Subunit: 317 residues, 4 copies
């Protein structure tokens, strides 16, 4: 029996007897995602080229304005904005949203896959809302996921009930539920990172990579895949299994990806799917942030693959 994202979320929200605010949040977010998808696939591009005589900016505006007008949020943190955005009192709800409106858009000139990442916290304190309300560890997440604008558009939504995948049918502008209660493979056959930085690798990374090319137990070498867009690489990791790494290097001694709106949502999706996500020293979701734009190293994916990396890492202290 068919189901849509909005209907699925309403049915779960009613079972839980919530106020409805989270459903309003998510529905508004979905409206923003469908709007971004339409622009990313270049609907209307003919008008820009004169038929009748920016993209990361528009995506950010779409998310900001739909979340503000949902009456469900109070603090908004985006990759695009230096400081947290405080929702005006007459539109304030109880939820905090950290998002990357068009992740990977730096290389969008080659039509690489792009996406939107989001993580949702409930505001905890009785104080007036402020940037400090976004400085929660990932354990505190209420919901997280991403929209992938790849060969098709897909929304992956992780909540405490698990992970579910919804395909955008653009003929009717509806997210169709296509993969329920998704679990990642225990172990995969693909590893994913920028090997251009081989010169800067920690020794633990270098050894782990050598095990994938020259397997010590006589198994077959892993394949290598690296789109260079986090949402595409993570979603392949979810679908086919395997492991994704953005460890520390010389240009990025704390890694390059951002903790609040890149690492935490993907880590949350992995763990709800039976996967893992580590910085090397701890779980990503346990990192207590002190800066909304702070960076974090990330290694995630199938549990056997991450655990193997952690064994190698532990060997190097």
């Amino acid at each position: 029996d068919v189901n849509t994202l909005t209907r699925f979320v309403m049915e779960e929200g009613r079972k839980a007897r919530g106020t409805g605010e989270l459903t309003q949040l998510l529905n508004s977010l979905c409206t923003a995602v469908k709007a971004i998808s339409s622009a990313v696939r270049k609907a209307g591009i003919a008008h820009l080229y004169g038929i009748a005589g920016k993209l990361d900016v528009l995506s950010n505006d779409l998310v900001m304005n739909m979340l503000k007008s949902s009456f469900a949020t109070c603090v908004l943190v985006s990759e695009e904005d230096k400081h947290a955005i405080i929702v005006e009192p007459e539109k304030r709800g109880k939820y905090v949203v950290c998002f990357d409106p068009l992740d990977g858009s730096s290389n969008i000139d080659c039509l690489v896959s792009v996406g939107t990442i989001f993580g949702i916290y409930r505001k905890k304190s009785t104080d007036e809302p402020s940037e400090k309300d976004a400085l929660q560890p990932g354990r505190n997440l209420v919901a997280a996921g991403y929209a992938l604008y790849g060969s098709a558009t897909m929304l992956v939504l992780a909540m405490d009930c698990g992970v579910n995948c919804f395909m955008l049918d653009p003929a009717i502008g509806e997210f169709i539920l296509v993969d329920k209660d998704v679990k990642i493979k225990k172990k995969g056959k693909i590893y994913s990172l920028n090997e251009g930085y081989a010169k800067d690798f920690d020794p633990a990374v270098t050894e782990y990579i050598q095990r994938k090319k020259f397997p010590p137990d006589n198994s077959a070498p892993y394949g290598a895949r690296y789109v260079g867009s986090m949402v595409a690489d993570v979603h392949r990791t979810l679908v086919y299994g395997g492991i994704f790494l953005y460890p520390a290097n010389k240009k990025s001694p704390n890694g390059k990806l951002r903790l609040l709106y890149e690492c935490n949502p993907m880590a949350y999706v992995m763990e709800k799917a039976g996967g893992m996500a580590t910085t090397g020293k701890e779980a990503v979701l346990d990192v207590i942030p002190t800066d909304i734009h702070q960076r974090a190293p990330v290694i995630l994916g199938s549990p056997d693959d991450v655990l193997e990396f952690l064994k190698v890492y532990e060997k190097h202290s």
Copy 2:
């Protein structure tokens, strides 16, 4: 002044005073591509999941390309990645062109929504014999037109002909390919290398040396970045747009590479060379290989000319 793919092609064809057959070819090809794009983006998927109470995409794409080319009255021999033998067009629909295509390259991993694409190469039938598979056994040098459609974050048709390379963006609101990049030229040297390094234990020694030169530059230069989508159209297109180098080389286990010459290597080599880039097997230009089997494989290394030349120096250094 705005321009669309069809009109751009009509204006060039009229200037050249051709019969119109090639324009009819290209127009039918674009229609199948618009149909492929719509299925790839999962238009109508709600019906598969029971909203009202079916072929895999590579099968449907092959049917779309096949049926539009046959019904274009411009073709006589069609080679597809999907079919063991060439298709001979029925006499009442026969035109003068030979088309080799890959209808949905990269679709094996479309379950993760990776970029996919369509690759095509167009030849003039040269012999006066009855049309046959032998008419597709032409070297890449003989191509009249070649290109690809990339179904990525957006859909783009790249069309290379003797006049150069032009890029057309599909506006899905109106189903028209909008001309957005005219007479495109690749960077002389790039900063990205692209290949499956998981198989490093099987690398040819020249591939091992060249890749290490990229990671640990001997001249104190900055190392290159690495990108490998695993879908040829996406990787080659990034190579065209940002410059750099793409490798699917031969090794001991794969002495002739993995990619297919007629409808993967030749069309991309033609696009590269028209953009001021290069494309080599290691031993020669890809477009100079004289094929003997429509599904034969070929090693390919392509991209910015300085990068390809650097590879070829290393390849020669290993005798």
Copy 3:
């Protein structure tokens, strides 16, 4: 501040502190309507004509299956089905829905406007669901409206709070609120009926129309419009004012249009917009039905116009 149908209905539903079932129903119907629109605009027709080598039934299937799977309905009455459709026990909700899935589709070969008409009732008794639960007078309506597949696609939704109009943005599949709390003109300048059947007119109908063409005073005659598709004609009546008639005559003493899923929803929209809708003998919404497919004469529109018709109608009674 932008608003969509889903967001608008959730917000009223929260103010009203309801269980959420009605919001679930309407969201499901909305999805069916987007699906009908896509098929009506002939998306994918290329495949029907061989590029790779019914419409009213499909629309009926879309509505039936979306409503059944909403867990909000228990009895479904459609123009397309001889008997009421009883929702299976494990999916039964509290609402009764009467609809015409593709009204006007008889002339769809000429690309005429078509539409979907719906009316929603609360099941009143605790008995086992049966056709009898749909035999409520239009006065009992919880919500009613229509979707018009015209030059664009619009959903007109009438409830106790008034009538609101939503434009389908097909680029993102969202119904945008574009006209809030709409009211009909007190008096209009357009009359609408099939004059080809003039020889069968009731004598009061003949006189009233003659007064529209040959006003006994010094005013200008009314204009005439008749699309032949009820959703199209009633929506024009709502937007521009005026009067729409499908009256009774000697050969059709009860009219031809159907009460449960054409006359009552349109009469309800009219009354919530400050209009009127009469059979000649009483308000349409006061008719107590005895058969789910029963017919009812209907005259509706701007109140001064409807009241003028009743004046002429009394003279011949």
Copy 4:
């Protein structure tokens, strides 16, 4: 075997061994029509209502004007939206003259009534410098004419010397698919179409003819009545279902209401190529020699038997 509009026109163009200029015109027009369709169906309206924080008839006119100019096929363009004819700049001049109504019926688009685009295409006949006079040709001189109907779906009807062909816009791929080949209208229909709101102004022939439709003197069944009020919608129904369409003169419109250059002549061309008729009462619409690009004309068109029946009544009243 499937066929599209562009493919259908090229194949006929190759057979005719013409230069390609008309094919270039028509392809450009079809591109503007798809852009109009997308706008008319309100794609992107969410942005106009603030999702991120031109009137339709003006936009449509811009789309046709700019696509035809850039086609290198036209020299004089006449539009319902512009007071004077537009002369194409010299470096873009081709041989064709185009009269069009970019969004006919848009006056009542607030109620989502069907709207449409009407076009008629002429070869420039005079060798003088291009000017407004190059559009003052009788409809008999048309090379191509037709319309796009933005109704429940979008359909393009194309009439040429070879006959009338109907193409359905599949919005999933932005392609016009051939769905009705070489269309012929019914010899006689059962629907008449006109604004009876002007009954007090009808001349006696119109009054008698309508009375014959409601009270048939042969005791046959009355015709049904339909009047959308949008010309493209009413004419298309007439073409598909047969019957008769009327917009006669009245007191507000002593020379008729509909426009000769880009409403009456193109529909008259489509009707006659479909085996129908289209008359002013005094002569065939296509025989009227215009003197002013926006001049009006009375029109009665549709199935041949129905028009011929009207003309007998017209003859009876002298």
